[PDB]
Assembly symmetry: D2
Homo-oligomer: 726 residues x 4
């Protein structure tokens, strides 16, 4: 029952490209990668090699294959305490999943600022470009359960736990700059509306159902984040290729006591990229773990996810200077009006060891701030502060959740709190209250000040009556959806139309669809008309005459709202499928792999069976996967080298591979007789932008292919894909 | 008044084919379908129409659109107990999912024997062809979570709760007549091997990964149920078109004290039918709720699932 | 600084007698004490001196006196995360108490065997006289809640966690050798019956109510342990002065595979000693924490509780050699038939740091055995095996209760169990199953063997049908109660009579008293008639004529069953009240204290107020407590030195002090004019045995008093007490 | 939430209101009430928005907080009047 003699059961502890080695726990894959938080977990990491198998009480087990029974065909006996411990632990493995964001994928890393920000914040982690802060980041979807699929259409969560010298700061953000609703009190209504419906618990991972669109049609405040969800922002290529936002106006407080309003951003250094809907939807079935896997493999490969933290800063005196309210979380601050100032870089460079212990039990909460930061009266943020501490009592079993290893501060913590379920810390303090004389009042309060001081709230002025009332300034719902729509490229606009059209077609009650198209007519008539046409709805004369909402402080558009209007592609970490034949032209493959390696682009070698094939020069080529086993959905581009093309020319799966990739706007490159496949995707002899072709793969051929990949997808192909049956 | 005037928001309370009407809670869709268990649940069913919105303490809520704050742009106050009750209940909605068979779809129905089986068993529910026993049945996959997809390749669970006059009898079976392993002490090894692997929690709803096949390779006792799972048995068209089995030899005991060994079977009256792999896998993406949906809509149409 | 300038807030970190210093956490009181288990808890100990006060997230708090509000008289804001974290933790401090034995007191210590027992067991902890095994021991009552009183009449638990090199071994015993019932299926019935009655939840800490005596009257199997409970065994003086027993036959298994039957014993090296009923009852009012306090103070003083472990050993071939069944846990094995072999010594030498973390969270379970031990078919032990694992899932929050620090093995533990609530260990094993090849099958099973082998059950032969049936061999109920009764002294018999009589008088339904009296008539007529007389019940002619049960294997008594038949007194750690006056004779007091010191006996100096008084010769005498404040219930003897007796001669409290101690059979010593107090307890001029008196407090005055203390109480005094109004 | 096991402690019999209670809260450990409402959110059209909010009034109205005037800065400070 043992390891192969050749050692092939164990992954090399060195960076390796995706699929080259089995994946492994981070501490075993990359044992030399360290940071302060990682090292602090060593008290709880448990190895295994050369140790005896035991009960949890440390009793060695002789036979872990059988229950104790009276004769070898007799009843199992109650005194089998080894059986009952083992089965009891198994019977109690699951804990409640997160109410929202249950599906998520996490890694360790570090952050450092580019320069001291002491002029605007006294936060210690932003104070010195050479002070490194460990982080643990979890990316998530929102609606689906922990076992739902990754590449759904949904908002994404992006939560960073900063283990600072002055306490834990959690920046708990999402991949769009707003939310669907204005006041925390409605959160259970909105979440119930988008979640599976209560009678039958359908659908999983999808807003495409009657209750979501019912809520939206009745609550126009939602329309801004709906526009974002219906765009390709709803279906990112990778957690490495989406933006992060902190969602609310918070405050930075400097040593002098000055408050600046701030909104937080994460800029992906790998660039912004998304799937297209047919690809995303099909990929939920071909690999529901695609984003989790891609994140883990990028880190094992050394393509560490990097993000730049950025702040929009608004002086306190400018609070009212926009035509929207700064505290309204359904409103974004356009970068044309307030630029993002670069602040630092975050690098994720190690996977966890055990997903349950580190990912599933991690608790992030936006109320976990540190001196130098503060809140605002954003009425969504305000209610969040209640929820993230409350929910842990059931999810994590009690108030000692900060003692779960992933959650522990690396900064000291000492206070007079005691007891609670599964209390780990054994307090020696004679006193469990203050003020005390019997321990000379330790641990002691600390005055606020420039560094290492106690937390004091910014003394914001409050004047008003106790009311349950929405601010009149929040009562505008259409201008930001319009700004978003107008900032998208024409192909991005088409994809938004198609997203709404697809979703509303699954709404069973036709009046709901009508009411949504009526809302759309208040944003933009062209959008409204294009969705109506797809639903067989005709706009009324009144709907045709609805005045468009006002520009946002004079803006007709803001290109920073588009995924693609300003090129920002980075190919490093992307992946190509190489379709093999049984006699590959080795000269072609040599050139292909050389050019890919030079740009840090990975390759997977595919064939019609597993095992090996041999190239024209005798090189034995191991096969990563079959055409069907690793579909074009999972790669960025497809290359077909020359050789014995007859071997695959008539293979339905190989032909389909190219039809799917073509339909999904991916670059395709065909060398030598591989150009015979031009017939399957109807490319004219003259060729076509987005199809690289030549007698052989070479300098010029790979440069062209790599240029295409830098632009992500071949948007000019869109008119040609209606026709292809794929 | 937000409902449309034409009343098209509300499904007809009569049998209707899949897609014809929105789906609904069973007591609304089919109020006149009753059995002893369904009737006994009436003490806890809560309606809604014509009732005022309240806290859990029965206090009417005037504004369910806003938190209480000091000024309409000011901070939310701690004394907002309506907000806090509502968000507290939300924050604690979830309970642990089942360790296995977390993904499952269920319905109410009834059982009746063809004839008295008193010669072989004194079980009251099998004593009289005119004795009707309410059931509640839950069909499931095995490996994936509660939010995993329906049409994966996996074993299916088929659990029937019989509410008999002499106590609950649960027949907790699967859609193949055997299991992977021989001794319960190995159950956590086997389940850990098939479940998502522990470093990264991949893959969901799939035995197609190293640790499952490593365990199979070292434990040849598994090969029988593996054969079943690799066949199209692993990818049923519908819970209505798969077989059920009680897995073990049990005993029947009659009034005279005689024991007879028994294995239990369910025969689908709709016939046996399965998908093909490419179809099943693609379907987990196009509709991960396909079997849950099909079961609910068959029942709403009158195509009641029947099993012998 | 809040601490006083003179440092009197901090207890001396050295052994001090009870009352001399405030008590402290063990690691602060006795930092130099250590053992392997205490060392291994260091990673979770939290200090406090010189640290800042923080949130659990490590954020320094500036003001720990106020909530955050909108103006200093305004409403509290939801954004006050520091308030909600602190109040959240408080709100969830409590965990379920233990179903039974909820009230208990615990200490750390160590165990060492006198010689290797490898000829009879391969248990590692017993294999070498140099092997020292850390322990943690919790003593308890059974019925009352965690906040009930110590000196109730009840069975006591005595549970020892041995942290061995081959696993945790928990020896979960009580202070009597048997239990009330035979089969574990009845445990919830018996426990419900003794516990507070379900309509009104009365009475706490008492079996003196209808449902207990109903159950007993209907289940004569209970009578044996009821005899023990009704004797002074049910009201021990101290956890240090009671016996411990393992309750069941277990097995020892040597390296050759030979099984020997064993029953486990603890012998108190401080000797056997119990209160009397009136004293124990009043003491639950005057100090409901008396045994907890006594234990903690003994350890702080260096009077470490010490116990000798002993084994009764029965060869397998002697299973059926007795008049009773070895597996019947209502039957004791008389030491006259099977002597206790001494095995080793345990010493308890360090208090915990935090009572909740170490005591309340500790989990003991008799299924926790190690290679070299095994179970038997005792049907009470059999069902115990199920309960002690199960109960922790709610009490301690889930299946990772072995990760709570006090419960952790010091031995290695490695296995394939994963997850569960509060999971601390982060497993790096690529495998969570076996057999596996991907980690070369580690951690691996270990064959059984002579040392460091895997656990294998002893291959006992099982033969019979599947039945729910009591063995006919267990159907004898009276001979062991009779042997117990006959083995007691006449004063111990009187106290049994009075225990039944007092308990049955609290039973409201008379027929239940009558039914119990009928049971007693089956044990011993003298016993039965004496209890009947106290209840106004007359035994029938049939009752008068019940043949007594047989002797047990020819024995008509066994003096080891008596607390006092065979003297085993030890005065070290006992306490004397010294009653002061405003002008004490300093030469009496010097002599008193000098002799008490030489025998390790403590003293408390008592007066009518606090502060100090001054001796005839100007010596300043500090007062520990007032007469009312430290009643005679709390001491073992009373001494009144000479001097200004007139000062206290008419003090009600001072007089009553001597009356109460006199009533409770305690030694009393009077010097010089303190002899005037002889009037208040009605002592004749020639004196009486148990009252020491002389012109001055020496020559042989303190030897006399110390001799009386060594015999614990003045049993001869019993006839004279009924005439005293106290 | 720890003492009584979860957020449905109002369904424990002694705690239950005798007044009606209806709302859009769902699930939680040991959930007794089986809701038949097609909607679990408001505003909804699919159940004509029931159960519905009630304006405050002299009898049988919804709860509205007294509109006390609040003026001051966000402070952690004891009122001098308490000293
Ligand atoms: C024969 C049909 C069958 C077999 C052989 C097994 N399962 Fe099932 N199972 C649980 C434990 C368990 C063990 C210990 C073993 C072999 C030792 C089996 N299973 C094999 C469980 C963890 O206790 C379980 C999880 C949730 C629960 O309540 O019990 C469990 C579930 C389960 C279901 C689902 C019932 C439902 O709630 O829908 C079914 C149909 C099976 N098992 C069948 C089954
Ligand atoms: C012989 C010493 C003895 C005996 C015979 C029993 N108890 Fe104890 N007990 C639990 C259950 C249980 C059962 C099922 C039986 C016979 C069927 C006994 N008891 C008799 C328990 C409910 O599982 C218990 C409650 C908390 C816990 O973890 O286990 C339990 C407690 C207990 C203690 C307390 C240990 C401690 O934490 O101090 C002791 C000394 C005993 N039992 C002794 C005992
Ligand atoms: C008042 C309710 C509420 C509101 C209005 C929001 N959240 Fe939230 N959020 C929760 C209440 C909550 C929660 C219920 O407390 C969750 C799930 C359980 C968890 O610990 O927190 C959570 C989880 C959660 C997570 C997952 C963190 C993780 O990986 O564990 C993210 C990323 C966000 N939220 C992001 C957002 C964003 C960008 C919001 C827009 C501003 C937002 N949430 C509003
Ligand atoms: S947000
Ligand atoms: S089975
Ligand atoms: S016992």
């Amino acid at each position: 029952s043992l390891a192969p003699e050749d050692g092939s059961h164990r992954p090399a502890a060195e960076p390796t490209p995706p699929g080259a080695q089995p994946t492994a726990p981070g501490s075993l894959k990359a044992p030399d990668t360290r940071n302060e938080k990682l090292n602090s977990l060593e008290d709880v990491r448990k190895g295994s090699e050369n140790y005896a198998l035991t009960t949890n009480q440390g009793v060695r087990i002789a036979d872990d294959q059988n229950s104790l029974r009276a004769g070898s065909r007799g009843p199992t006996l109650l005194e089998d305490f080894i059986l009952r411990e083992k089965i009891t632990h198994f019977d109690h493995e699951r804990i409640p999943e997160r109410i929202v964001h249950a599906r998520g994928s996490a890694a360790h890393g570090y952050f450092q600022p580019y320069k001291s920000l002491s002029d605007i914040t006294k936060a210690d982690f932003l104070s010195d470009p050479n002070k490194i802060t460990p982080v643990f980041v979890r990316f998530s979807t929102v609606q689906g359960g922990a076992g739902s699929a990754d590449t759904v259409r949904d908002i994404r969560g992006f939560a960073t736990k900063f283990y600072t010298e002055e306490g834990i700061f959690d920046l708990v953000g999402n991949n769009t700059p707003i939310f669907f609703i204005q006041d925390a009190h409605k959160f259970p209504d909105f979440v119930h509306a988008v979640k599976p419906e209560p009678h039958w618990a359908i659908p999983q991972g999808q807003s495409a159902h009657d209750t979501f669109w019912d809520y939206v049609s009745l609550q126009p405040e939602t329309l801004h984040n709906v526009m974002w969800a219906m765009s390709d922002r709803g279906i990112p290529r990778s957690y490495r290729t989406m933006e992060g936002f902190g969602c609310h106006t918070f405050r930075l407080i400097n040593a002098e006591g000055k408050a600046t309003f701030v909104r937080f951003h994460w800029k992906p250094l790998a660039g912004k990229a998304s799937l297209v809907w047919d690809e995303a939807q099909k990929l939920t079935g071909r690999d529901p773990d695609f984003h989790r896997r891609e994140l883990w493999e990028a880190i094992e490969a050394g393509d560490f996810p990097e993000y730049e933290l950025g702040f929009q800063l608004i002086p306190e005196e400018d609070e009212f200077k926009f035509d929207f309210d700064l505290l309204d979380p359904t409103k974004l601050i356009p970068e044309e009006l307030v630029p993002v100032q670069r602040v630092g870089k975050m690098v994720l460079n190690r996977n966890p060891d055990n997903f349950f212990a580190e990912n599933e039990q991690a608790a992030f909460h936006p109320g976990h701030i540190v001196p130098g930061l503060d809140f605002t009266n954003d009425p969504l943020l305000q209610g969040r502060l209640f929820s993230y501490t409350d929910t842990q009592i059931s999810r994590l079993g009690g108030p000692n959740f900060h003692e779960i290893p992933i959650n522990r501060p690396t900064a000291p913590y000492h206070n007079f709190q005691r007891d609670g379920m599964h209390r780990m810390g054994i307090d020696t303090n004679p006193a469990n209250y203050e003020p005390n004389s019997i321990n000379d009042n330790w641990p002691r309060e600390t005055p606020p000040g420039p560094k290492r001081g106690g937390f004091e709230s910014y003394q914001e002025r409050v004047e008003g009556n106790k009311v349950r009332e929405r601010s009149p300034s929040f009562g505008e719902y259409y201008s930001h959806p319009r700004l978003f729509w107008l900032s998208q490229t024409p192909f991005e606009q088409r994809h938004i139309v198609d997203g709404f059209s697809f979703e509303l077609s699954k709404v069973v009650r036709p009046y709901i669809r009508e009411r949504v198209v009526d809302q759309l007519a208040h944003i933009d008539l062209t959008l409204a008309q294009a969705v109506a046409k797809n639903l067989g709805i005709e706009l009324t004369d009144d709907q045709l005459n609805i005045t468009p909402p006002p520009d946002v402080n004079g803006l007709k558009k803001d290109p920073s709202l588009s995924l693609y209007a300003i090129p920002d592609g980075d190919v490093k970490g992307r992946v190509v499928a190489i379709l093999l034949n049984d006699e590959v032209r080795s000269a072609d493959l040599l050139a292909i792999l050389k050019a890919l390696k030079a740009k840090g682009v990975h390759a997977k070698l595919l064939y019609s069976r597993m095992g090996e094939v041999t190239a024209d020069d005798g090189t034995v080529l191991p096969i990563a996967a079959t055409f069907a086993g690793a579909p074009s959905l999972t790669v960025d581009a497809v290359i077909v080298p020359a050789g014995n093309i007859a071997d695959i020319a008539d293979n339905g799966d190989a032909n389909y591979y190219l039809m799917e990739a073509y339909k999904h706007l991916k670059p395709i490159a065909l060398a030598g007789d591989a150009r015979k496949f031009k017939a399957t995707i109807k490319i004219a002899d003259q060729g076509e932008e987005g199809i690289v072709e030549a007698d052989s793969a070479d300098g010029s051929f790979m440069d062209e292919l790599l240029t295409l990949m830098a632009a992500h997808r071949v948007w000019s192909r869109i008119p040609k894909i209606d026709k292809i049956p794929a």
